Amino acid sequence: MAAKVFESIGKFGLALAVAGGVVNSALYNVDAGHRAVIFDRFRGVQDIVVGEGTH
Numbered sequence: 001m002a003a004k005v006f007e008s009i010g011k012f013g014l015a016l017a018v019a020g021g022v023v024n025s026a027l028y029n030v031d032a033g034h035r036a037v038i039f040d041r042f043r044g045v046q047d048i049v050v051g052e053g054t055h
Helices: 002-026
Strands: 036-040 044-050
16 A cells, blocks of 8 residues: 555655666766866776767
């Protein structure tokens, strides 16, 4: 009834918050005239330079 589904909803709700956050943290914007170098803590800096835009 109300109890089970809503409880799951509760889990969903917090999960959604978390998920939204991760996606948010996932996106980055580089302004025009700027270029981003990506460095991984594991690998170090990668050779590919990223241009303007959201990535």
